[PDB]
């Protein structure tokens, strides 16, 4: 069908781990850059 489809590449982003001081705490926060969690 003579229709136009835009192609944008698969989402990629550096995973950054937000870590409070290991002695202070053990919980973890993970960051997915420039990606909405709907895709995640």
């Amino acid at each position: 069908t003579l229709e136009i489809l835009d192609i944008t590449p698969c989402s990629f982003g550096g995973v950054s781990v937000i870590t409070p001081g290991t002695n202070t705490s053990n919980q973890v926060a993970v960051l997915y850059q420039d990606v909405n969690c709907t895709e995640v």
Partner: peptide, 22 residues
């Protein structure tokens, strides 16, 4: 004043509105 093969533009920590606030 007026790139997807693994090249990522990390946003500034201070947003343009926040830089304007400074």
């Amino acid at each position: 004043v007026t790139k997807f093969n693994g090249l990522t533009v990390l946003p500034p920590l201070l947003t343009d509105e926040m830089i304007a606030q400074y």
